[PDB]
Amino acid sequence: QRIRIRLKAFDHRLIDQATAEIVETAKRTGAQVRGPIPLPTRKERFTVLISPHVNKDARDQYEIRTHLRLVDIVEPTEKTVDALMRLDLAAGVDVQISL
Amino acid sequence: NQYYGTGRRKSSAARVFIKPGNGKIVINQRSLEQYFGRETARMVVRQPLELVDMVEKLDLYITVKGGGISGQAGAIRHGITRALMEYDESLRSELRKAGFVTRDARQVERKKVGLRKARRRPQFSKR
Amino acid sequence: AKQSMKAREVKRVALADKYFAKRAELKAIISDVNASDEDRWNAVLKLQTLPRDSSPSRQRNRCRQTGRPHGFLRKFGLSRIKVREAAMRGEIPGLKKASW
Amino acid sequence: ARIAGINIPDHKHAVIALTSIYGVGKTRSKAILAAAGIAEDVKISELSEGQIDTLRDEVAKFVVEGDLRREISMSIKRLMDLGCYRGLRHRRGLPVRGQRTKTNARTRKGPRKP
Amino acid sequence: RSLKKGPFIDLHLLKKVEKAVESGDKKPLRTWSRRSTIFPNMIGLTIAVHNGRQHVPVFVTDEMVGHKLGEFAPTRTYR
Amino acid sequence: PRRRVIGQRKILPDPKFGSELLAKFVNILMVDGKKSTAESIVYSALETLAQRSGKSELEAFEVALENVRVRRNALAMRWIVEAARKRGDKSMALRLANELSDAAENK
RNA sequence: CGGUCCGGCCGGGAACUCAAAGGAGACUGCCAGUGAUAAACUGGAGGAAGGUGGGGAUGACGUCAAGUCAUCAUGGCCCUUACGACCAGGGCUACACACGUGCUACAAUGGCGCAUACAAAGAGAAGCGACCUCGCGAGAGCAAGCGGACCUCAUAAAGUGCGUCGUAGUCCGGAUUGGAGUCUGCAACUCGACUCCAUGAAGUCGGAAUCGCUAGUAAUCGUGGAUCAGAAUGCCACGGUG
Ligand SMILES: [Mg+2]
Ligand SMILES: [Mg+2]
Ligand SMILES: [Mg+2]
Ligand SMILES: [Mg+2]
Ligand SMILES: [Mg+2]
Ligand SMILES: [Mg+2]
Ligand SMILES: [Mg+2]
What we know:
The structure is cut from a larger assembly and holds chains A (99 residues), B (127 residues), C (100 residues), D (114 residues), E (79 residues) and F (107 residues).
Chain C: H1 3-16, H2 23-30, H3 43-48, H4 80-88, E1 96-97
Chain D: H1 14-17, H2 26-36, H3 49-59, H4 66-82, H5 85-92, H6 106-109
Helix pairs in contact in D: 2-3, 4-5
Chain E: H1 11-22, E1 29-31, E2 46-50, E3 55-59
Parallel strand pairs in E: 1-2
Antiparallel strand pairs in E: 2-3
The structure holds magnesium ion (7 copies).
Chain B binds one RNA strand of 242 nucleotides through strand 3, strand 6 and helix 3.
Family (chain C): Belongs to the universal ribosomal protein uS14 family.
Function (chain C): Binds 16S rRNA, required for the assembly of 30S particles and may also be responsible for determining the conformation of the 16S rRNA at the A site.
Keywords (chain C): Ribonucleoprotein, Ribosomal protein
């Protein structure tokens, strides 16, 4: 079989901290992982008015950066599964598992 | 022996693969005359191979994605110059003199708030 | 907006999942079926007796905190001015001023 | 070459010369030449009389003459004599199908005069 | 404009037609359905079409079949 | 211009003939960024001037350029193109070819 | 490199392009002249980039009782079987005119027809919706894939190649109008979008006056998104040629 973990977060310096802890734990217990791959960032952009009335020209410029990380695990070792499945990760990281 | 050089433009990206000896040009599994519909686009890639003489002397195998007519052609023209510097390494002084190794980094100016275009302002009243 | 105007919108949503969620969903299909009941489906006449305020076209997406019917965003459910007030005080995660 | 459409077509290509008939545009002129068997770039020269009257037979299915002028007009007479809202728009020269009347109604209203 | 799968008519106005055909012609019928399509079973009756503030009676004619009742009520007074 | 005194940009020359001056000529006729349709008109106009109106195509344009004289060459090329549009012939290649024939014979 | 059903499609390859986490690199650093030996300027080399490289964010004290009690927050006042509240329809879209802001034009640097090449950036689950089939078409039916670098919107348009029209109110331009239809939605009359047939106004480059912009800019070409059941010539972004 093959399990993969899709990781998404808002902060780029926070997504790689949660990514490296999974890969280091996997290499220590003897699992085969072909590293993490950087997926293209799906970034939204929001341009809305700052004024409630006339002077239309002054606006705000927002963005929402959503990075993506994927870790591919080849062998479903029981020592690998039992360790990674209940890790204590960052609150700003959403996990997606495909068993 | 292969000699590689990366050249690109606004949204293009082109690879250059050099093999010694032919006058063959293969771009995206097509010919030089078949792919380039513009006659100017055929000649601008011949511009870096003007000071350095090529007739039937080296292969070039190129692919390119993105951009347009001259955006792909400018990507090839940059990529050949880095390949010849990889090929001979003494040819740099002639390439610096022509100005082809300088990557054209003039990108598009962003669309501004309050204006319909990058610098074009909507029409103005005096009083 | 006015408090009575937001009471209208809650009344429309409460009828929206009530009547037109699944019942008008069926009545939209039976009028659309090409295979059977090509002439006498009569689902149009039964749709007339249903109340109007269940309609998804009649409801208006408004700001959940103020009730402004203008400048709506489906990303947060707020008006354009209330997006700034939570962003400057750090109440919306990841939202900040952009430069490109 | 005089058709049942008595107004004389110009001495040019076939699909252009059929456009001069009131009620035959570019699309319908393609359909007549396709049903006849005449190429669209054939001029009035060498277009023999055996090829003119076979264009009269294909155009005979449609009413394209002053008889078409009255049927457009009497259809408007149906609206005006009935007294409908759409009939009131044609009598004063106002737009019908939802064009605005604040400004930019110059085709309907006629030339300006304060 | 409207699709061919069913010309629209309101339910309350359709009931007012059915009693009027059987029980004979009456006083002009006050209604608000400016969106209904005229059917051939209404020829002869007088239907008062509401125009914003009043009711204008419309004597139904044979060639009115297919049009709307809102096309017989001017909504503004022009001077 | 008051303080910022800078030079003028040096465009790449004509890829067909290797002429710096002819590259500034096609940009005047070019509208809406259409380079590919502009040089097709200019090349077809000069071949009419070369084959049926006098050999030495590069020299034949210069004789037409000399009578109507950086800025001196710029105003000379602009007067040829703008007067060619308001003519009676059919295409732009035929109109600009007759302007160079008239400018070579200074009329 | 093997494999050919000529599709990266399949074994595989980790080179390269792309994708994004970190880092190097440009600092008048080096040389020459000018300048009071200064700051600096000028010229040249090196370099992908050289004189704040390109763009953005970043906008002092104050000025106009400039704009916002109709985003919201807030002192007071006023009404309260009514200045409140419910619903139907109408109006906000009217029409003798005026002003400002836009689009498409007046065309052979084009129009139309056939064949055909190259984008970047986004959106998608009460959603995007392929393929197949049908209709001239707007679409409809059948029905996968996809919470997505996989699948869909989605064939980018200008351009290129040929043919045609030959300078005219025209195969220019499409206004207006009639007829016949499509989709959305309780519901398209007032007042929707789009397609098909037909009609083919004004207009042949625009007075005084007035505006934008010093380079990937102007000009022009289409694409996408927000708002939205539906309703973009506006606004926001994105690239193509230049
Ligand atoms: Mg309040
Ligand atoms: Mg609505
Ligand atoms: Mg005609
Ligand atoms: Mg970096
Ligand atoms: Mg004031
Ligand atoms: Mg036309
Ligand atoms: Mg400036």
